[PDB]
Amino acid sequence: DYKAFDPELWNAIDAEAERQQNNIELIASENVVSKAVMAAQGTLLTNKSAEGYPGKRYYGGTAVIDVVETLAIERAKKLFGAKFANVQPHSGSQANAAVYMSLIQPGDTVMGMDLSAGGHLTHGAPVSFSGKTYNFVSYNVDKESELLDYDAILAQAKEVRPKLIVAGASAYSRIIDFAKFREIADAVGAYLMVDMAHIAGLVASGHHPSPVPYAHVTTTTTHKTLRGPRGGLILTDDEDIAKKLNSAVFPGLQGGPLEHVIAAKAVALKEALDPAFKEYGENVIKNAAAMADVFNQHPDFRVISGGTNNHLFLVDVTKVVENGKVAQNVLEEVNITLNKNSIPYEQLSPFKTSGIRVGSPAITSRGMGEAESRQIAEWMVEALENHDKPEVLERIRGDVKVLTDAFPLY
Amino acid sequence: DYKAFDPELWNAIDAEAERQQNNIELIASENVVSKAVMAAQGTLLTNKSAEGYPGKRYYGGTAVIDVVETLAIERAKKLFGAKFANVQPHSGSQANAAVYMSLIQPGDTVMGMDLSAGGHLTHGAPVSFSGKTYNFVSYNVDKESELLDYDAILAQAKEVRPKLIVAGASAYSRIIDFAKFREIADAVGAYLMVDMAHIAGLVASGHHPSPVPYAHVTTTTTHKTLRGPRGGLILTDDEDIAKKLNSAVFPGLQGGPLEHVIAAKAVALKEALDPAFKEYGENVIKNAAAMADVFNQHPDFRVISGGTNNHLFLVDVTKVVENGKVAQNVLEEVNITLNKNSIPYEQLSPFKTSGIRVGSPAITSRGMGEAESRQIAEWMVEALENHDKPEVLERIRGDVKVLTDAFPLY
Ligand SMILES: *Cc1c(COP(=O)(O)O)cnc(C)c1O
Numbered sequence: 001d002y003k004a005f006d007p008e009l010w011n012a013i014d015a016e017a018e019r020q021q022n023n024i025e026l027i028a029s030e031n032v033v034s035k036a037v038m039a040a041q042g043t044l045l046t047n048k049s050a051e052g053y054p055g056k057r058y059y060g061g062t063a064v065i066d067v068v069e070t071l072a073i074e075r076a077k078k079l080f081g082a083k084f085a086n087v088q089p090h091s092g093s094q095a096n097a098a099v100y101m102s103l104i105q106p107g108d109t110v111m112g113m114d115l116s117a118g119g120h121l122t123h124g125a126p127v128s129f130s131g132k133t134y135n136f137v138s139y140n141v142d143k144e145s146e147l148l149d150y151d152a153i154l155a156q157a158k159e160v161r162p163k164l165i166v167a168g169a170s171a172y173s174r175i176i177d178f179a180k181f182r183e184i185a186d187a188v189g190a191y192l193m194v195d196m197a198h199i200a201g202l203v204a205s206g207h208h209p210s211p212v213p214y215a216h217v218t219t220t221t222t223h224k225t226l227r228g229p230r231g232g233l234i235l236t237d238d239e240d241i242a243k244k245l246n247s248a249v250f251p252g253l254q255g256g257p258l259e260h261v262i263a264a265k266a267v268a269l270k271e272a273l274d275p276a277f278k279e280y281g282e283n284v285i286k287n288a289a290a291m292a293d294v295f296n297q298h299p300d301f302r303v304i305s306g307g308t309n310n311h312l313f314l315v316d317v318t319k320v321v322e323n324g325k326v327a328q329n330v331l332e333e334v335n336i337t338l339n340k341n342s343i344p345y346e347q348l349s350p351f352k353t354s355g356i357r358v359g360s361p362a363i364t365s366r367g368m369g370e371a372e373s374r375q376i377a378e379w380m381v382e383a384l385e386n387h388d389k390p391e392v393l394e395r396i397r398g399d400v401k402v403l404t405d406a407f408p409l410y
Numbered sequence: 411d412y413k414a415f416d417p418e419l420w421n422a423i424d425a426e427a428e429r430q431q432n433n434i435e436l437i438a439s440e441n442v443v444s445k446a447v448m449a450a451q452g453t454l455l456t457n458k459s460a461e462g463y464p465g466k467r468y469y470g471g472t473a474v475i476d477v478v479e480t481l482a483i484e485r486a487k488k489l490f491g492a493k494f495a496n497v498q499p500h501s502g503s504q505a506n507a508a509v510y511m512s513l514i515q516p517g518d519t520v521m522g523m524d525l526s527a528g529g530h531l532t533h534g535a536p537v538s539f540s541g542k543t544y545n546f547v548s549y550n551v552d553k554e555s556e557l558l559d560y561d562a563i564l565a566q567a568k569e570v571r572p573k574l575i576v577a578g579a580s581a582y583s584r585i586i587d588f589a590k591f592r593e594i595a596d597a598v599g600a601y602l603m604v605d606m607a608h609i610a611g612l613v614a615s616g617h618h619p620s621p622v623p624y625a626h627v628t629t630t631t632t633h634k635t636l637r638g639p640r641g642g643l644i645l646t647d648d649e650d651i652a653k654k655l656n657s658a659v660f661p662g663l664q665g666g667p668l669e670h671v672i673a674a675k676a677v678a679l680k681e682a683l684d685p686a687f688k689e690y691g692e693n694v695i696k697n698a699a700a701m702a703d704v705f706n707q708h709p710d711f712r713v714i715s716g717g718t719n720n721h722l723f724l725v726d727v728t729k730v731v732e733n734g735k736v737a738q739n740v741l742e743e744v745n746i747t748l749n750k751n752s753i754p755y756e757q758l759s760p761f762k763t764s765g766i767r768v769g770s771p772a773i774t775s776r777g778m779g780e781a782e783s784r785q786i787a788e789w790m791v792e793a794l795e796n797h798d799k800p801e802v803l804e805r806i807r808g809d810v811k812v813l814t815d816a817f818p819l820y
């Protein structure tokens with residue numbers, strides 16, 4: 001009994017397993033990985049250091065590690081249709097750090113999505129290494145439509161003359177035209193990086209256009225929609241850039257890779273290669289649409305861009321609670337975690353925001369469908385209309401338990 | 411069930427457990443973690459995105475995760491004698507990157523140990539962000555004694571006037587005087603960073619003086635001598651440095667921490683707080699000494715600095731095989747993994763080297779003792795003397811096999 005040595009730690013692990021079961025996870029980044037993905041991270045591959053790349057290791061005894069990493073590498077190439085993959089990045093933050101390091105120089109100018117319109121921290125926030133190391137100039141969505149305007153971007157690009165354009169977002173609901181982003185990049189002589197961390201699973205599933213054929217380099221996380229272990233991944237079709245990327249990940253930015261997590265990457269990528277992953281993607285698309293329909297129909301809420309063609313959507317809540325932070329707290333009391341979130345052309349402080357961000361991938365991996373998704377948005381609408389009224393929140397929390405009980409987690 | 415879906419990957423994982431049993435691991439960086447450490451990494455805490463810090467998270471649903479991270483922080487503060495601890499770095503390299511971001515500006519001068527006397531890549535290699543981002547100037551050991559010379563280092567520091575001195579090494583056998591390093595830093599108005607990755611276990615066990623009282627900031631891997639999951643850890647007693655370290659790690663450098671690996675850190679730190687960890691420490695010291703003795707007493711080999719007071723030691727092999735690369739290969743042939751290693755004032759090319767590096771932590775962790783340790787060194791001498799005599803190697807493999815059988819890995 002290894003658990004018996006450390007009850008304080010393993011009682012917390014049980015408490016979290018319980019907490020998850022009794023919690024509706026609507027946070028768009030979140031998912032529920034298979035038992036195989038978890039099992040793989042908990043193997044004795046943690047024991048073995050593999051500084052270097054397959055058949056170019058610093059150390060010996062690395063023959064079987066090369067099989068595991070080469071599987072992961074080959075499975076990502078096959079799934080995403082890329083000539084080159086690096087599976088060693090510890091996180092999406094590090095995968096992004098390696099691409100910047102490979103394509104541009106400290107102080108060089110970079111275009112990323114506005115951080116209220118769907119841009120990521122790592123796409124130029126001044127509190128991120130990304131902001132501090134490079135000159136980031138944001139491109140917005142159109143104010144009226146809340147859509148990417150490829151004409152407006154192209155004209156801004158022509159003035160800013162960036163060395164690099166970043167596309168991909170964590171709060172944009174609509175299909176990105178990657179062909180148009182590359183057309184713009186080519187129009188001004190810049191690289192295109194696509195950070196697809198949010199949509200990588202929808203890309204695996206067929207439901208989002210691939211940026212792989214259009215981006216010079218594509219980064220993603222292996223967690224989020226792709227539903228793998230916590231980590232990062234870099235794809236490219238350019239052999240010269242693959243060489244630079246490999247160098248930047250190690251020994252540029254990282255030391256030894258987490259080969260146990262890389263075994264969980266290989267596993268999860270094989271799961272994404274299965275026809276059942278197409279079904280999952282389909283249900284991610286429907287479940288999010290079902291939830292968003294409910295906010296569309298209700299007069300006191302506006303969905304950003306009018307709806308969604310991916311795993312998530314934002315809602316302006318400001319007609320019903322003071323701000324997004326309030327919205328967020330209220331729903332935690334009914335055992336529904338989402339997150340406050342900026343909306344295009346945000347008026348309020350970044351700590352308050354005008355919006356909530358809903359996502360479908362977690363409830364979808366639990367086995368929930370459109371009925372359940374609609375039900376959960378009605379509950380969100382009731383709880384938020386009745387933020388004042390604890391007797392009301394208390395009834396809803398009891399209904400949430402009925403539904404969580406109904407849909408086990410593992 | 412779930413392994414049937416992916417036989418290719420789970421057979422490679424069976425292959426690596428086999429290989430690990432049938433191999434004598436003397437790579438000094440390596441260890442054998444407990445079943446609890448692997449188990450904790452294989453739990454559903456990978457599903458919870460926890461950006462931020464305990465009671466200051468971006469997302470709700472994070473109360474239990476706050477218990478698991480605070481366990482790790484508190485266990486690290488207790489074990490190491492530190493007022494502040496950050497358990498979020500994905501690796502030693504990321505831990506180091508966060509400390510540089512916290513204490514110095516890009517282009518500032520840093521002294522670290524030479525990448526040939528025991529310096530790490532992250533201590534100024536031109537191929538690491540360390541060398542690229544900062545002005546690294548390396549300090550050496552005395553040519554004659556192979557010891558750090560605290561008077562020479564002070565003399566160098568007065569000339570180079572660094573913002574930061576890095577102490578700590580990956581190939582140095584002797585007790586470091588952390589008070590002397592701080593005296594030098596204080597003498598020249600420099601911060602002191604100690605990277606104790608290789609010796610964190612022997613510090614935990616009480617067999618190596620703590621740097622914690624003397625370093626402005628201590629970094630380490632949670633793996634290596636401390637026998638934890640692969641990751642990093644930062645320690646300081648300065649509240650204002652702790653605030654900057656925390657910002658640096660997130661959102662400066664990382665995104666979401668690996669809360670499952672943090673759980674495993676928490677397990678490992680409680681393991682190293684146990685009295686049994688002191689015996690592990692004692693046995694690491696005796697076993698490495700036993701192995702060093704054999705190279706000392708043999709005329710054709712020289713141990714660097716004449717021996718060791720920690721877990722590792724270097725041997726000049728060049729009076730027996732052409733270089734350290736050949737030594738590494740011969741020994742792989744008989745199921746002993748170690749690494750070629752630059753020695754002080756290395757004459758040969760980095761790729762070839764004069765030296766081998768032996769460590770006791772891994773065999774110590776498999777329950778081996780002084781007798782076994784001496785046998786392995788005898789076998790290494792025999793094998794190397796008789797390198798191009800396949801008759802002999804075959805018999806040593808057979809012998810090794812008998813010993814690996816005798817000490818099950820798990
Ligand atoms: C191993 C090591 C590191 C880096 O750890 P990774 O987890 O490989 O990034 C840094 N410093 C020292 C002294 C080390 O031994």
Ligand SMILES: *Cc1c(COP(=O)(O)O)cnc(C)c1O
Nearest residue numbers: 091092093120170197198665666
């Ligand atoms: C989550 C995310 C990242 C960073 O991933 P971490 O593993 O948390 O470092 C980067 N970019 C995007 C778009 C993301 O969604």
